[PDB]
Amino acid sequence: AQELTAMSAWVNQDGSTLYINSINAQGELTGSYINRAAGAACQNSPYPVNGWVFGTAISFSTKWLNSVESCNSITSWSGFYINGQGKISTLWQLVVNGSSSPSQILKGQDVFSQT
Amino acid sequence: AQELTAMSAWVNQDGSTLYINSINAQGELTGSYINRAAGAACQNSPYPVNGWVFGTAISFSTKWLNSVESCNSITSWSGFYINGQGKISTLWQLVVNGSSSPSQILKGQDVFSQT
Ligand SMILES: O=C(O)CCCC[C@@H]1SC[C@@H]2NC(=O)N[C@@H]21
Ligand SMILES: O=C(O)CCCC[C@@H]1SC[C@@H]2NC(=O)N[C@@H]21
């Protein structure tokens, strides 16, 4: 099973990839995200990711701005690792610049499998 | 009104403080969090924070490990800035190491005011 390690790649049910680049001694995470969810904006280019790992708990977040496309928004995922196949089961929140109410924060669920 | 700037402090309804230390040119955030919610664990000591800012959108997350106390968990906040008083209205998710179901991810709402 792939575990939560530096240079690990994870794909969700919609085909999006999280790449974890580094996890430091304190568990701080860097990486990048490529969105491929059918019909979504900001697809097919890398967006920087930061976050934390604590054992099997993981959080990661991306700002949807790069040289290719801006979605004026930020997603945060909270989740946990489960295993002979590694997966990360998450809940996510997406907040958009210019929001007026927490009711406008989109929520969903993503399950990522090792690759 | 205090706005989303480096070296800004924000207090929620439960008395916890977010301190934003830096926001870089790309909007990546560093800071620290001190929890003071009545009855909570990991109170009264600083926990490192990372995250993103995009205009008025903000995400930030902390791993609850420091030299004083470990809570084996990570919180992520997603929210937005509103204003003559600055506030950040957020939804948060708390995930614990060793979780087996997304139903175990605690959710809540925090509203932070400038100080
Ligand atoms: O629409 C936006 O504001 C930017 C793209 C958001 C894509 C989201 S993030 C949560 C979910 N998981 C994915 O892999 N894609 C969508
Ligand atoms: O119990 C834990 O696992 C660690 C402390 C969690 C404190 C939470 S984070 C969400 C909410 N906002 C606060 O200021 N404190 C609680």
Approach to solving: X-ray
Full DSSP string of B44-108: SS-EEEEEEEETTEEEEEEEEE-SS-EEEEEEEEEEEEE----EEEEEEEEEETT---GGGSEEE
Q: How far is CA A36 from the centre of its chain?
A: 12
In 3D space, the residue among A25, A33, A42 whose CA is nearest the CA of residue A88 turns out to be A33
Terminal Cα distance for chain B, rounded: 10
Query: Phi/psi zone of residue A88: left (φ > 0), alpha (ψ -120 to 50 degrees), beta?
Result: beta
Token pair in block for residue B43: 């109170």
Helix, strand or coil for residue A110?
A: strand
B3's enclosing H/E stretch is none
Question: Shortest CA distance to B23 belongs to which of B49, B52, B57?
Answer: B52
Range of the domain at B28: 1-115
Can you name the residues that pair with A31 across neighbouring β-strands? A20, A49
**What residues does A74 pair with on adjacent strands?**
A63, A95
C-alpha–C-alpha distance, residues B39 and B41, integer Å: 7
B41 DSSP 8-state letter: S
Residues 6+ positions from A63 with CB-CB distance below 8 Å: A47, A48, A74, B26, B27, B28, B52, B53, B54, B59
B103 Cβ contact partners less than 8 Å away, ≥ 6 residues apart: none
> How many domains is chain A built from?
1
CB B59 within 8 A of CB A61: yes
Query: Phi and psi for B86 in degrees, rounded to 5?
Result: -80, 135
CATH code of residue B21: 2.40.128.30
- Number of other CB atoms surrounding residue A112 within 10 Å: 22
**Spacing, Cα A81 to ligand 1 middle (Å):** 20
- CA dist A77 and A91 (Å) reads 6
Neighboring chain B residues of A81 at a CB cutoff of 8 Å: none
Overall resolution, Å: 1.5
Query: With an 8 Å Cβ cutoff, are B78 and A65 in contact?
Result: no
List chain A residues with CB under 8 Å of B98. 55-57, 80
DSSP code for A39: T
Q: Which of A52, A55, A95 sits opposite B80 (nearest CB)?
A: A95
